[PDB]
Structures are given as C-alpha cells and as structure tokens.
Design an enzyme around this catalytic site. Structure first.
Site, mmCIF file in Angstrom:
data_model
loop_
_atom_site.group_PDB
_atom_site.id
_atom_site.type_symbol
_atom_site.label_atom_id
_atom_site.label_comp_id
_atom_site.label_asym_id
_atom_site.label_seq_id
_atom_site.Cartn_x
_atom_site.Cartn_y
_atom_site.Cartn_z
ATOM 1 N N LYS A 68 0.819 -1.204 0.000
ATOM 2 C CA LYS A 68 0.000 0.000 0.000
ATOM 3 C C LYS A 68 0.857 1.261 0.000
ATOM 4 O O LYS A 68 0.660 2.146 -0.829
ATOM 5 C CB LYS A 68 -0.967 0.025 1.194
ATOM 6 N N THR A 69 1.808 1.329 0.927
ATOM 7 C CA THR A 69 2.645 2.507 1.099
ATOM 8 C C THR A 69 3.423 2.814 -0.182
ATOM 9 O O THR A 69 3.381 3.931 -0.677
ATOM 10 C CB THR A 69 3.589 2.333 2.314
ATOM 11 N N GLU B 299 -3.422 6.005 1.168
ATOM 12 C CA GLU B 299 -3.384 4.629 1.615
ATOM 13 C C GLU B 299 -4.666 4.359 2.407
ATOM 14 O O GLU B 299 -5.088 5.194 3.215
ATOM 15 C CB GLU B 299 -2.143 4.407 2.482
HETATM 16 MG MG LIG Z 1 -1.172 -4.362 7.472
#
Ligand SMILES: [Mg+2]
Ligand SMILES: [Mg+2]
Lengths: 476, 483
Positions: A130-131, A174
């Site tokens: 995600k990041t 995110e």
């Molecule tokens: Mg996690």
C-alpha cells in the site's frame, strides 16, 4: 499555505463549517500526523496528544500545532472535534472529557473521508504494498503537474513528509483494512494490491469476512468508479465477478489488462515492459527493486493511464522514484575496517516488512541485482499475536538467507504467548540477540567481505537501524 | 448551460467519467424528470421511457432528450447507465434488457446522490410537507443570489419546473423515505419535517424500523453537518438523543430553537413571529395558508440562518412564495350562473394530500382562511393498503367537510382489498350522521355530480394523489360547466 493561496483553494475546496479546532488523541500514531499536517496547512487550529514524542510530532510543532505529551481532560478544551487513533481505548480521559463536553469524537478514517469529500479520491488498498504504491501514484500525479494532496502511511522520500496538501483536486491515500476503517472512504478510483491473511483479529479468523470487507469497500465506488486489481493474486482472480464496478486488472498473468513481462532487476532498479489496451508497448525503468514493485508500478500506471496522464510523465516519475521511509531503504555502504578488521564493503538496508510475504519479497529483491553477496538479516518479529498463527510460514521464509540474527518479539501490548517466542523460532543456523544496546557487537563476528545486512520488521528495530547507520557499524 | 458556463461548473462539479448517455425508466413522474433536466443541462445525452406524455416529458424533449412511450428492450440501447423510479417493477423489459447488456442499473436516489456528491447537499426528508419545504428552501437560496440547483417532487411555480441546474454548489432536494432510498444521500444539512406511519409495507409494518431508518439517514450527515427537525412532532422529540449530530429544533413548542409564535391566518396568507438565538424576533408574512406551512417555513428559515443568509432575503422569498403544483393550488373562482343556474361563485383548490394528516391540514387551512364558505370535497383514496391501515383516520378527517364526493380508490398497482373500498368508507362516514357522502363511480361524470351541491359561496377542494389531478384541471377549463 499562505492566506492568498488558501483563499484560492477555498474556491474549489470548502472549509468544514464551524470547525475551528481539531484535536488528535494519539497524534504520533499510525497515519494520524499526516492528516493533521494537511489540516494544519488548510488553516485549521491543530492540537494533539501522544505519550511518545517523535519526528512526526516535531513536524507538527513546526506547522504550529500545540502538542501535549500526556492524556488529560484539559487537552480537548475548545476542540470542534476529536479524532482518535485505533490505539486509543474508550476509557482515555480525553475521550471521556469530549463526551462530557458533547464534542464529536471520530475515528481516523472518518476524518480522512472528509478530506476526500470535495476531492477526487484515489484509495490504495490491499494487504501488502500500500505505502509503496500510494507513493508511486502521487509521484506520477506530481510529475504530471496535477499537485495532488496525499496521505501515506510511510514517509515519501522525495517530499520529506508522510502527507502534503496540494492545490489540485486530487487525494491519493493509503486505505487501511486492518480495522476495516477504509469502509468510511468514498473514492473515485481504488487499488487492491492483494488480499492475504493478516490482522485477522478484526475479522475473527474468518478469511471469507476479509474478502467480503474488500468487496464492500470496492462497492463504495460510484457506479462509474474504477477498481484496479492484481489478477496474479488468486483470491483477487476469484473475487472479480463479485465486483460490481468497472475493473482493470494488472499483473504478470497473460489475460491481465495491464500486463508485465520481460522483467529483470539490475541492481536497485527493475526493467520491464507494460502492455496496455490501445497503447504501444511501454518499456519501464523503475527506481525500485523486485518484481513485487513492478506490480506496484503497474497498478500506478493503470490509474494514471485511466486519468489520461501523458506517458513521458509516467516514465519520468517511475524512473526517478525516491521510495518511502523504511521500505527497502538503503542507508549506506560501509567499509569493514573499524568493525571486524577485514577488507571490503557491508551494506545496510532497512525494511518495515513484518509479514512472511513482505519478508520473502525483500530477500527475493536482495538476491537479484546483488547475487554475489552475503545475506545477513536482523529480524524483529511483530507481536506474539502474529508469530503464533504464521509460525510455519515465518520459519520457511526466514531460512532463505545466508546468516541471520533475531531480536525478541516486539510486544506493543498483547501478553507473551509461550512457544511463540524468538527463542522458539531460532532453532526450527539462527542466532538470537537479547541485548538491544549491543547490536554492532553481535554483528561483528559474522561479516565477511561482500555483505548486505537487512534490518527487518516493524517495532523499534527502526530506531536500532538508524543507530547502526549513525555509528557506521563501529561497535563502540 | 452553454459551453463556457459548463467549463466553470466543471472546476467544482466534475462530470461522471465515461457516462455519455443516461436512460430513465419512468422519466415522466417522481423526481425523475427533474434529475433528467439537471443532467440535460449538464450536457449529458438523455433518454427515457414512460406510458403517457405529460408536461415533464415535453420539457425534456425540448431540452433534447429521446423519449419512448413504451417499455421495450430496445429503449435501453447504447446507454451508459439506466436509472429507474420506484414505480417500475424489477422485471420491466428495459431493466431486464439492461442487466442482459451489462449496463449498470441504479435507483433514482443513487443518481440523486451523485448530483449531491460534489455539492453542498440540503435534503428535506419526512413523511409530509417535503415538496413545500424544499420549494421554500430553494426560494430563499435563489432570492439570496446563491443560484442553487434543486430537485423537487412537485413543480416549483416561480420557476415553472420541478428542477433546475444552478451555477452554485448548493443542491436542494426532496428525499424519499417511502422506499428507504434516501439512505443513498450524503447531505450537509437535513430537514426532517415529521415521522408518521405511511408506506408501512417497506418497513415490514414495523414503525420502529421507520424511526431507525430516519436515524440512519441522519447519520449520513458528517460530524459538522446539521439536522433541522420539527420538535412539535412527539416521535421526533423522542428520537433527539439518538441523533448524534448537531441539531436545531423548530416548532410551536417552548423549548424549540426556532420557535413559531403569534400565528394568524388571513385568507391565503399566514402571519407569525419567528424567534431565533442571538436574533431579534422575526415578523413573517408567509404567502401560504395553515399552521403546517408556518412550520415548513420555520424549517427553511432555520437552514437559511445557519447558512447565514441575509434576513431581508429570507422575508422577501417567504412573502412572494408562489407555491408548488397541486399543493393547496388555487385554480380559480367561477360564477355559478352557467353551471347550475344559481348566483354566486365556487372556488376551486387542488391538493395532492393523500394521508389523513395532509387532508386534515388542507381542511383546517380552508376553514381558517375562508370560514363562511361551504366546504365541498372531491376525494380519491390512494391505494387499498393505505385505506385499510388508516381507515378510521380517513373517516375522522373526511367527515369535517360540509359536502363529500368520493371517487373509487386509485389502486396505483395494487389489487383490491375487501372492506377497504370507497363505498366501505362512505357507509362509515354516513353512520357518523354529520354528512351524507356521494359516490362518484364514473370519473368523467364529476361536474354532473358537483353542480347540484354547489350553493353560491363554495370552496371546492379536489383532494388526492394522481388521476384526480386530471379531474381538477378539467373542472378548471370547463369552468365547472356541468356538462
Ligand atoms: Mg497491514
Ligand atoms: Mg409519502
């Protein structure tokens, strides 16, 4: 932003009526400071409380936020609204004072959702990546000159911040599934990188609940919204028909709408081709290692292509992508002289990865691009709560290195489960480390001449990582 | 909107990506035409279907929309999205065709919610009085030069339309609870006029499910949003602690934030005083009859002052308020000479009211504004289910008129239910011994039945939802002429 710049923003994004002052219980908690930063530069009065001062609280003080380092009823005095992180318990004196004062009290994601209200939201969701992917999307949009507002769970290295207010209409964020809070978000476009068994305590051991939550999330899109999804993931592949929205898949798979191929890693970079509908094949130089980041880049390109962002802009952004804090974060290369005494170089790579898949991907990325090197890993497993359920996978993954060191399980609460210890794991070549103050001493007798040390895990191993960089490895 | 106007709008309200063509199944009624019109002026391609032409479909044609008078699979071709009203069965050929073609099908409210997405939405919800209140709110906002876009359930007389696209960021829309679809809406401000038992079928006959649904709707408000709610309503007064959002109350009650006082009705106009915090008492002249409309006005005023609208604009709009189609709608005053010989006149008032409370409000308004007239009513019950559930209440209010004529129940899709007839109800009213209701079994023989009972100083209320609307207009053009 200055008062003239803000006035210009207000002609496109309105203020929240009567919201003068915003208070954050746990302002240095995961993802809190970033929202706070954006709100500070939108001209709101910002305050917050946390027990542990850090670089985030430091940044927030510079932006004019009053930060308290305790929890007391007075800390919410005068607040229009109180925003609490998941870490905060219902008993906290600040919450109790807020209710007594009839001050609205909201979760982190509720406030994130309000940032998304009069913006074009691009929510990056999934179990892993995600990041990084969020950072790649904001890199592209910034390069396109679209000046997006972004809220990232990690430090975006090119910007020196977790989050930034832009003059654009875009929000790139995110989206956390770990507490199902992302269900508050209402984006235009959503990415789902992958779905795997993690944070299961919020879905009570049922993996089918997690799949459904992700589906419910994607169902937050408008009828004309777009889901961008990694078809390589077998759970995503089977969930596709349950997605009632337009979908563009990506991956190495042959049927993928955006398809990766010809992948090879040369050092810190990746080189691959991207096949897109109605487009000449695209040759990509990615300033990031590992075919997992290739997938991450494909997701970002899928979103950017749908936006109609120029390809050159996509290509420049990805070519010079500066990464994020603690995500395969190369800290330096050091001579093996004032430590050990040999001759050559030992490398330091910092990584947040705490789940077997993340860890596996880091090893996979180290091995390719640097094949003739000694893989040394310092690993701090995160929570007994986690180490038990994935006991098998941890052992099978961690063994893929050369030499390995382990710290004691980072608690973050959750009383020690016996048999889930580090000592339990480092038997099933491994070598345990009890003393946190003496780490370079432990590391000395196991450094050859051509090394790549890999500091792994969440916890406080990040503080022990920067130290091992400060001292240049000198055991003191 | 012209090209450049649209480009401006698009700086704040974006287009829906890749939606070229919007098709409306049932384009003719609800707040369906209104949405089509707004979307037409935003420059989307518009098509729709309905069973009979009307003023709404005419307007849409003039705006460049393709309208089919039938329901066939072809009507849906090349549509980016299909929008369906609550009046459309799930197996309607067009809906089935749309699913077959993989074309997204959404309810009216979902499309309404998209209009509201990047706007400052003000939703007017409640059992009764929605159409009037939302018209009142949009009048104040138009008056203040805020140029709101609005979507009403009835024709807004001053505008000549149900709905209009404005340049502003305000969306003022009537919210429908009758099918629970107002849960799609994400407003900034929400009015709840009242909560009463109607459309109980969709709430499984359970009045608690209705209350909870209103609570859930209100919870769509963000933490800094506002609920404007009528406290005179005991059900609303009870629900207050469950709301959990900033709320300002209104009503004749003492503990109301916006309190109404000194109500007098003079003819078609209301006169009263509004008390607001940190404000001098406001002396309102309202161009609408009845206590119920003073409350609707108070709702509108509460919203406007929260918005910080200038008080002079508020008063201008309330005084020159032109009402909405079929809401205590004056159609004329006709001489009796050529209808039944007699001298004098009969006033004709059209009203949509279909629920006992609404019908009672129209009666009270007729009474107070014209006390000495002979009150005649032509009433048509809507549905058998409603008639069954509210039977005693219909009898209680309907017996308050001097002369009652009643049409057969307009089923609106429903099958007949024994005991819930118009003739059932007429026996009951007759039994009360105050008036002797006349059945009107042939809806074209209305003026025939009407002429004999007109005295020389009459006020005719034509009362009910749909079908009776036609009859009301017929009576106006033939000028009551008994043919
Ligand atoms: Mg996690
Ligand atoms: Mg209704």
């Amino acid at each position: 932003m200055n008062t003239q710049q803000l006035a210009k923003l207000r002609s496109i994004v309105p203020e929240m009526r009567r919201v003068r002052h915003i208070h954050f219980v746990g302002i240095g908690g995961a993802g809190m400071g970033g929202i706070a930063e954006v709100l500070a530069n939108e001209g709101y009065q910002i305050s917050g409380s946390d027990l542990a001062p850090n670089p985030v609280t430091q940044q927030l003080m510079n932006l004019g936020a009053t930060i308290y380092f305790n929890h007391r009823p007075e800390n919410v005095r005068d607040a229009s609204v109180v925003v609490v992180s998941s870490a905060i318990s219902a008993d906290n004196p600040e919450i109790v004072a807020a209710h007594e004062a009839r001050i609205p009290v909201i979760r982190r994601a509720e406030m994130l959702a309000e940032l998304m209200r009069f913006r074009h939201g691009i929510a990056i969701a999934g179990t892993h990546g995600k990041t990084t992917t969020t950072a790649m999307v904001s890199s592209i949009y910034a390069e396109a000159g679209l000046d997006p507002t972004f809220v990232n769970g990690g430090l975006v290295k090119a910007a020196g911040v977790h989050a930034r207010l832009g003059h654009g209409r875009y929000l790139i964020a995110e989206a956390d599934e770990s507490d199902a809070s992302f269900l508050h978000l209402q984006p235009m476009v959503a990415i789902v990188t992958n779905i795997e068994a993690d944070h299961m305590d919020t879905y009570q051991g049922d993996f089918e609940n997690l799949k459904q939550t992700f589906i419910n999330f994607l169902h937050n899109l408008p009828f004309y919204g777009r889901a961008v999804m990694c078809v390589d993931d077998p759970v995503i592949r089977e969930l596709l028909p349950r997605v009632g929205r337009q979908t563009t898949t990506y991956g190495f798979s042959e049927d993928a709408d955006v398809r990766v191929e010809d992948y090879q890693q040369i050092g810190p970079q990746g080189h691959f081709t991207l096949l897109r509908q109605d487009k000449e094949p695209m040759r990509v130089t990615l300033n990031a290692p590992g075919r997992h980041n290739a997938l991450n880049a494909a997701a970002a390109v899928a979103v950017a292509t749908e936006e109609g962002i120029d390809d050159e802009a996509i290509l420049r952004a990805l070519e010079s992508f500066q990464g994020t804090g603690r995500r395969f974060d190369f800290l330096g290369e050091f001579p093996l002289e004032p430590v050990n005494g040999k001759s050559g170089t030992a490398m330091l790579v910092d990584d947040y990865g705490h789940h077997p898949t993340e860890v596996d991907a880091t090893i996979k990325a180290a091995r390719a691009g640097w094949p003739d090197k000694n893989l040394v890993m310092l690993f701090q497993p995160h929570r007994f709560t986690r180490t038990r359920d994935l006991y098998d996978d941890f052992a099978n993954v961690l063994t893929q290195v050369d030499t390995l060191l382990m710290l004691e399980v980072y608690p973050a609460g959750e009383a020690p489960i016996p048999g889930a210890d580090s000592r339990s794991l480092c038997r099933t070549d491994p070598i345990l480390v009890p003393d946190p103050a003496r780490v370079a001493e432990m590391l000395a007798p196991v450094l050859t001449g051509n090394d790549l040390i890999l500091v792994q895990g969440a916890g406080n191993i990040g503080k022990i990582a920067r130290s091992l960089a400060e001292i240049k490895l000198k055991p003191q």
